[PDB]
């Protein structure tokens, strides 16, 4: 080997690991505060406060709710034929035309909201024997009286309101959404003055369904100078089917159809400002980054968003236990 390898010394080698002066507390199966070298947060808890207008198509409703934009309140005429990935409805929106109510407002708002288009096609309905285009001063269009742009108020002609019985075939290859309605007079006098018959009736049907609504006379609260109301209804006509509208008074008639589509559109109530930036995840509190798996900003989301959780912090340890060498 060598010869008498005599140098009798020894050495010491010690294994160890790092430690940091700072260090973060994380939860465990056995402990709920244990300090680790490093951790990363998994709950996103803050919004930018602004709805980024990209990548999705945000339509700002300004002072229109989607239903008034659909019906055609004069002040919402801006929205005709408009489209959206997300329609934002503002707390300030207001109606300002004839007083109406929609029996299942929630379904009609949902149904239009996810269709995502207000594309309207006018059809040639021929109303014979009634006066068309009735309006009201509660729905001023310009200096004059008006009404919902997409609805046609029919009243008597001369001394008679005939039994209207019209039909419109769905000959296209898509579903047609028809919004129609009925007028509820305040007084029997009002009823006979407008529709002659002392009791109106609207029956709208297809091969698949039928709705017959009869009006209801009586005073409601004064809203924009009026105690009358009109209630809104909707009928979807499938390809190949046929619409038959039959009325003997009080019909607020459709002027055509909205076309329906199938996509990712939705609606959101939010007063957040829209801004120019790209963000996938929208929250009514403004966009949030979807880098983290969970979020605690809002349970209402649209887009690729983190999963809403009750917790506002959850730290994933990304380092060993911190056992400091003093702590400095």
């Amino acid at each position: 080997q060598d010869l008498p390898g005599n140098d009798n010394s020894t050495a010491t080698l010690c294994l160890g690991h790092h430690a940091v002066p700072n260090g973060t507390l994380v939860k465990t199966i056995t402990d709920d505060q244990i300090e680790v070298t490093n951790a990363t947060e998994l709950v996103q808890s803050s919004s930018t406060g602004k709805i980024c207008n990209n990548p999705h198509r945000i339509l700002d409703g300004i002072d229109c709710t989607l239903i008034d934009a659909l019906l055609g309140d004069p002040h919402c005429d801006v929205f005709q034929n408009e489209t959206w990935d997300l329609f934002v409805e503002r707390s300030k929106a207001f109606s300002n035309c004839y007083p109406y109510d929609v029996p299942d407002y929630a379904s009609l708002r949902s149904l239009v909201a996810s269709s995502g288009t207000l594309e309207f096609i006018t059809e040639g309905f021929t109303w014979t024997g009634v006066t068309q285009n009735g309006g009201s001063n509660a729905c001023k269009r310009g200096p004059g009286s008006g009404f919902f742009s997409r609805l046609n108020w029919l009243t008597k002609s001369g001394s008679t309101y005939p039994v209207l019985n019209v039909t419109m075939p769905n000959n296209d290859n898509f579903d047609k959404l028809y919004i129609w309605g009925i007028h509820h007079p305040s007084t029997n006098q009002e009823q006979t003055s407008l529709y002659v018959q002392a009791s109106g009736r609207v029956t709208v049907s297809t091969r698949r369904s039928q709705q017959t609504i009869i009006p209801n006379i009586g005073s409601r609260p004064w809203v924009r100078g009026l105690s009358s109301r009109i209630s809104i209804y909707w009928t979807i006509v499938k390809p190949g089917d046929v619409l038959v509208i039959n009325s003997n008074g009080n019909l607020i008639a459709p002027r055509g159809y909205f076309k329906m589509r199938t996509g990712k559109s939705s609606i959101m109530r939010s007063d957040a400002p829209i801004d120019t930036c790209i963000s996938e995840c929208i929250t009514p509190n403004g966009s949030i980054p979807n880098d983290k798996p969970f979020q605690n900003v809002n349970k209402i989301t649209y887009g690729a968003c983190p999963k809403y959780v009750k917790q506002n912090t959850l730290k994933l340890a990304t380092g060993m236990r911190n056992v400091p060498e003093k702590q400095t």
């Binding site: 010690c14 690991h17 609606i267 380092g319």
Partner: protein, 175 residues
């Protein structure tokens, strides 16, 4: 944790080690030095990143859903709307909470393991030439200069080269 090296037979970490997570400090012929071990540091890091990546894997996207805030009192149907969402939230909250608990628990045992694996690896390499002092330090029983220390760290140490020197020093003595 499970292996008992970190916060175990190794008393505490070294705030001084800045160049890696696990390492060596020695005291020898030419003096006292320290050095991170990059293979175990990377092993620990790669596992923790893999784990981390799996958790950030795809936010799934959702578009039209149910209403979740209501302004009128409606009764039966709205109670269900509220109940579907609240039981959804408590279930996802449960999941988040249990996920980071299992995860953290495991990240501490994983890094404890790597610490112990490096300890064992060094043990095996020194063969009959060193003894464990029981606090993570080996007492090497032969003259080991800085090149000797560097071969133990880079894993090329040949025990045979020092075995007779070591065994004489280690046993013989006087008993």
């Amino acid at each position: 944790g499970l292996f008992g090296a970190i916060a175990g037979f190794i008393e505490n970490g070294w705030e001084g080690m800045i160049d890696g997570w696990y390492g060596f400090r020695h005291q020898n012929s030419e003096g006292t030095g320290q050095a991170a071990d990059l293979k175990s540091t990377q092993a620990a890091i790669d596992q923790i990143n893999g784990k981390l990546n799996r958790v950030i894997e795809k936010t799934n996207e959702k578009f039209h859903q149910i209403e979740k805030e209501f302004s009128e009192v409606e009764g039966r149907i709205q109670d269900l709307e509220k109940y579907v969402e609240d039981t959804k939230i408590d279930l996802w909250s449960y999941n988040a909470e249990l996920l980071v608990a299992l995860e953290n628990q495991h990240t501490i045992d994983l890094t404890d393991s790597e610490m112990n694996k490096l300890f064992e690896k060094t043990r095996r390499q020194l063969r009959e030439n060193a003894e464990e002092m029981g606090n993570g330090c080996f007492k090497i029983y032969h003259k080991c200069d800085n090149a000797c220390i560097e071969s133990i760290r880079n894993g090329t140490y040949d025990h045979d080269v020092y075995r007779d020197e070591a065994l004489n020093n280690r046993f013989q003595i006087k008993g």
